[PDB]
Amino acid sequence: PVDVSVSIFINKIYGVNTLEQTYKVDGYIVAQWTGKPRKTPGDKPLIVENTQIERWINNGLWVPALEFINVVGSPDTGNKRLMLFPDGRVIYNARFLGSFSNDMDFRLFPFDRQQFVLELEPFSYNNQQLRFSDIQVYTENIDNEEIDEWWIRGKASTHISDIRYDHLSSVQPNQNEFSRITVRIDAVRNPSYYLWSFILPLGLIIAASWSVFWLESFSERLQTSFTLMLTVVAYAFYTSNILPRLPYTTVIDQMIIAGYGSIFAAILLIIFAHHRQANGVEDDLLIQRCRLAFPLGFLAIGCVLVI
Amino acid sequence: PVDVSVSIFINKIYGVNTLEQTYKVDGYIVAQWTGKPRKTPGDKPLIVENTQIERWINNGLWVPALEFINVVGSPDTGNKRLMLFPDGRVIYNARFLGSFSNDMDFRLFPFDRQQFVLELEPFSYNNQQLRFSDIQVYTENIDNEEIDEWWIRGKASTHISDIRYDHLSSVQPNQNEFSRITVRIDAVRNPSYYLWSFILPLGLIIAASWSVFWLESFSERLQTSFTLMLTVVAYAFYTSNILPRLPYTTVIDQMIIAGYGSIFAAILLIIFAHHRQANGVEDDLLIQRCRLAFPLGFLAIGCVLVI
Amino acid sequence: PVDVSVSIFINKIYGVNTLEQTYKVDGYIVAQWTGKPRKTPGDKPLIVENTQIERWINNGLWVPALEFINVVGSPDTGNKRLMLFPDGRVIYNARFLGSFSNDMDFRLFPFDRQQFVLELEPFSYNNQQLRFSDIQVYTENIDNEEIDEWWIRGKASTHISDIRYDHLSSVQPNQNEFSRITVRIDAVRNPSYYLWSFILPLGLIIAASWSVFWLESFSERLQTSFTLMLTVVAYAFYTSNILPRLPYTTVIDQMIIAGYGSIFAAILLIIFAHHRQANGVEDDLLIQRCRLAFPLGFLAIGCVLVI
Amino acid sequence: PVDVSVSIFINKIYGVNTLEQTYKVDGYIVAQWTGKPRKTPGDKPLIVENTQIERWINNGLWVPALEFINVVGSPDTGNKRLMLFPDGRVIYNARFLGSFSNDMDFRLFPFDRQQFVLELEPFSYNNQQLRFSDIQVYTENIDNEEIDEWWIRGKASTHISDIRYDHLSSVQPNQNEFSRITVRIDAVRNPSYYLWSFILPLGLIIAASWSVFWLESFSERLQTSFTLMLTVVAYAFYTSNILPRLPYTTVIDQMIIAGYGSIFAAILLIIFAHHRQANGVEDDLLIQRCRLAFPLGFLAIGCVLVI
Amino acid sequence: PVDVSVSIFINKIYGVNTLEQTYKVDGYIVAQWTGKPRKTPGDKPLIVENTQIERWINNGLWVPALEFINVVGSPDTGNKRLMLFPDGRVIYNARFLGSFSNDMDFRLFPFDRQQFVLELEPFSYNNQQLRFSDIQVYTENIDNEEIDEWWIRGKASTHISDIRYDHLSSVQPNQNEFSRITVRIDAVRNPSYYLWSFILPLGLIIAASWSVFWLESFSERLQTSFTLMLTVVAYAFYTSNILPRLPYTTVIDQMIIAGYGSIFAAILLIIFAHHRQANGVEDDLLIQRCRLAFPLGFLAIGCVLVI
Numbered sequence A, B, C, D, E: 001p002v003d004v005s006v007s008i009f010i011n012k013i014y015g016v017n018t019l020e021q022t023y024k025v026d027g028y029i030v031a032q033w034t035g036k037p038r039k040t041p042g043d044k045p046l047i048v049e050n051t052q053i054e055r056w057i058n059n060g061l062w063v064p065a066l067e068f069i070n071v072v073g074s075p076d077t078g079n080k081r082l083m084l085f086p087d088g089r090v091i092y093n094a095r096f097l098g099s100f101s102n103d104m105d106f107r108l109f110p111f112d113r114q115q116f117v118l119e120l121e122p123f124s125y126n127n128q129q130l131r132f133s134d135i136q137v138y139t140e141n142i143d144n145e146e147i148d149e150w151w152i153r154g155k156a157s158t159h160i161s162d163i164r165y166d167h168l169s170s171v172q173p174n175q176n177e178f179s180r181i182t183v184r185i186d187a188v189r190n191p192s193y194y195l196w197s198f199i200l201p202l203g204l205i206i207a208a209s210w211s212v213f214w215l216e217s218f219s220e221r222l223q224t225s226f227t228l229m230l231t232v233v234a235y236a237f238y239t240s241n242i243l244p245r246l247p248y249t250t251v252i253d254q255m256i257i258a259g260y261g262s263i264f265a266a267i268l269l270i271i272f273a274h275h276r277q278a279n280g281v282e283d284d285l286l287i288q289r290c291r292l293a294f295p296l297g298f299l300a301i302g303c304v305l306v307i
């Protein structure tokens, strides 16, 4: 069992794809294991850069292939390097940019708790062992929070476990097990933009739609309600175009639905008030006075929902 | 005829392209056939990783090229590996991400039954035989259903058949036939988002468009109907922008068309009511009382259509 | 002059880009020419797969480079293979996906007659001759027509010609001429989606815009006409966003323009009716009765245009 | 100083990016210089195709690297070829597709005069000389003009100059100078689509906005003006979505601004007419009669602007 | 410690991605260090072009890998060249296009002060020293300012520093330190397009929304206010579609919010005026006369905000 020390440097996280549940990571990966002592030019360690590494591999140098389990496609590998010390240790350093996968729940969307994971694991080697994992996130989490889209909470996280693959080749007994490094980074979305540019005017619009009951004539009350409907549709459009695509409804979508339902309910009451009648036209006092009931009645449901 | 055992591990299915009828698959492929016994270092099997495999092929090692028939372009091949046992068996393991093709009917779109297929088959070898196919979909179908976009039903499916190519080279008689592995996975789309964020408010809008008959003045009835038309167009826009592009109409599109037709019909009746007349202005009782007939008359067609 | 037999298998055609006049083709290409007899292992023909082909070329094996003339960029070349028979024939088989160019007229757009062309021709060799071209389109043209976006008419088409390049190097006399294979596939667009989801509601909207003349008050007639204008703009938007981008106007765009012109004309008549007058207000009978003339007067132009 | 004859064949120009000031070119490049006589197989010139060229370079064959100065990124290089004549001449032929840069002024946008430039120049060689440049644009400029987006005027253009680089290595005196080929192609945009589908209905809308003064009641005049404002915004949207993105205003944008300004001015006059008054309500005759002044007053500015 | 002289030529800066905080740079990089004297053919320096450089590296020629620290992915490397002088100096010249990262604050967006940075640094070598950095931005900053999107202020900027990496391998004492070149270019966005096509009509719209108080009837005042709301939503859409996506609100977004708030406030006052009353209907003089207060009251906040 060969001991391998992994260090991962995270430069940037970006390009979140909500539909594909995918996010981009750029950084460095460093792997250090101790092999057989060697004779370098002078005593000083040897530096082997990109194209030459292959040449060394062809001469029988041993370089385990480490795979990102949760990666999508194949990473963009930048400059890579081998460092060979005379005392036998070997240090592989490479730069990568890759698209990674993980389970992501956006149902809370404006206010989101997401976590970005990297899963590393040897491709072909069951007994080679990951000694320890060190993650340098040092690119500052809090410098400007309201600039960066996501606010990163705490410094990384680490797990080194043994994954067992049940379905395998003819020889079971001693190796189903591969060592896996899991690095998770917790992050929270910045609600500002969505609160001010979406939630707020949406609220204003809903509240304003309640003002239909302060109209005098029935005709006015109806004809206006249609304009309201149109406004909600237009808003639904404005949101849907900018907002990220999802298989499910977010909080904002629910607000929109609440808008539609509020207006349709208003329509029903407005028509009901007219044709529930003394002779044919009598309009209900308390009902036309629902201008108080409707806003809080909505607010009741509003306070009930997140709860 | 060489026996080849194939195992395919499906990690993720995503990136469905409705227009191109294409979907992305990420996973592993494992091929195992038994060759001539060999002498490995020690007794233990030999592990040959990525770049080295080519070197082994150049030395006369035999590695059949397996082709995905239904793939689009060429797959993104990750880490690949050969495992050479002294008793002669050879196991090829590779990681891939690829875009695959298949016939897809979206006419039911909000509620969709689709099936994702992989078609494997040797490129150049007519007699080499696929022994058996095993598909590990083990990445959990039901864990969170309402998170994942598609709900996968059952565990995979398998067929191993012999495909005959009629048009071929000068020598017909014994080999037109190649062994083909076909893996199909049945899946059903999650209607939630579309029901709540599309179907529902669309319904509310249609129903509301029926309220035009509860207006008193002819002018009101018309002028309002135009606002309704506008609203339906705006909605058609909001849907069309978000929804996937298709060569054909879905259920929702039909609903939209139903909206247009309902409103235009309403216009016709509204004008007809005015100018079918006692003197010139007489409005038809039963017709202005169509407020009952129109909703169910639509509903009749609605219940007739899916039927 | 070397005789070369080409067979092309078309798997899929897709990704039409209207602006770039480009379309994607995936399939196989097979080239067969007869060289000098060879000694294979056993008698059986030799199979040389991807990476090895280059190695054979470096040993002086002759492999003409065939170029797609109308290709854009360079194709995605999948698995490729050489088959070497002892009697001297050589068969090159490769899989490709590529973007191809051709002249495309979309002026009829909803109903389109387009043709997809492949142009093959030796890169460096003036005397090497393409014996015959065979195109297997066998992937079924008619299975489900209303699923596939394009309906393919007939089985392919073929031409083998000699192209002469006037401008050339210092030596003219005997070779300006290269053999070119041209494969054309005629296809017709499926109008369904565009008829129902675009043409139809657009028509309904136009017809409805004629109902403005059934209004009583001048004010109503005007104020409504503006809402109509807005509706046409909104519709123009909804179409333009979904529909493919073009340098020219399609049929639908013309319909839109017809809408604008109809409404503006309506405005002119509505204002004219008011201020062409007995004293100042007199409205013209026949003119307010143009509710008959306008629809057919439009229809006249409509029946005149395609004609 | 080595004489090099360059011939460039332009197949297609497309993919204009207004923001990046970039355009795509596909074609062939041919370079011919005369080296030392050689012994070919037979007397006939030698054909060296793609992969082999490198092999020849490694044997000390001399192949100058020609760089496109104005290219963006690196070109997609298709099939390439060397032709070696026994009398010593060498002809390099390659196919390329590349994104090129040039200064582009879109301020006139609907009617545009643009020019597409290619700048070629040896990478490392100060004394090697470009003998002459020949550009075959022969792909027909005028066949169908209203199909192609751009109308190409005249056949190419050519310049061969000497560029001097001031800032250089330690040795100045005799070589700051590299030979540069510049190929420019003048082209004019097709205004049709923009005239009919944009300019025209925009005009109709503006003209129609002048009809607000033919309304009787002040309320009507205002309430309608708002609908007009909305219509102009909607139109601004429809244009902005389809039209290419720019750092500056085009002609159409100016028209839009003119729309806004016209309507706001109308608002100001409408309110002014009401509250500039005999008692409080008196409306100005000449002002309500500005229905004549406003259209030409706008037209005055319109005829003044391009002038 | 090897002295390395770097010169960087900036051709173009473009493709700013606001969300990813990324921008494209195209140009040349030149690195000059003095090695061991060599014997060239003749006395004249040797020119080694693209593919050959690798061959020289394989023979033990030393070519430090320089990394762009702030690059995203890996650059598109064009033609590259080595120049070997007999006196031992070596000059590496390469052309590159790459996407680079940097902190970008768009909160001021229409008027933006941004700075484009390049960070260069040896990949594997702690003692090799960057002698000096020279940046040729010579592509003209001021030629046409209103054409180019960004106005570049001053000629570049330069820093050469020593970066210390705390976390490292087992040997600390003398080398934590790598030499880093930092090149920063200050630029300011061109407000024209946004002022005229966005800020201005937005202002006109706001001002116009104040005209609601000049209406007589309460009904008019309300029903109109809704149309205003719709107009602001439509405008919010038109802006949001064209404008760049951000995690935060810009100035324009704030203006939009101000619009919504202004209209909602107007609604509140309009309803309050009606139902704060003598009997039930009395409308407040000063309140209906707020037509003066509202515009400046807004303007007060407007002048307070940037301040």
Ligand SMILES: [Ba+2]
Pocket: A076, A077, A078, E074
């Ligand atoms: Ba790479």
Ligand SMILES: [Ba+2]
Pocket: A074, B076, B077, B078
């Ligand atoms: Ba790959």
Ligand SMILES: [Ba+2]
Pocket: B103, C139, C140
């Ligand atoms: Ba099919």
Ligand SMILES: [Ba+2]
Pocket: A103, B139, B140, B143
């Ligand atoms: Ba899962």
Ligand SMILES: [Ba+2]
Pocket: B074, C076, C077, C078
């Ligand atoms: Ba490939």
Ligand SMILES: [Ba+2]
Pocket: none
């Ligand atoms: Ba879009």
Ligand SMILES: [Ba+2]
Pocket: C074, D076, D077, D078
């Ligand atoms: Ba290439």
Ligand SMILES: [Ba+2]
Pocket: C103, D139, D140, D143
């Ligand atoms: Ba042509």
Ligand SMILES: [Ba+2]
Pocket: none
């Ligand atoms: Ba050598």
Ligand SMILES: [Ba+2]
Pocket: E077, E078
């Ligand atoms: Ba390169």
Ligand SMILES: [Ba+2]
Pocket: A140, A143, E103
């Ligand atoms: Ba930062």
Ligand SMILES: [Ba+2]
Pocket: E139, E140
């Ligand atoms: Ba320039």
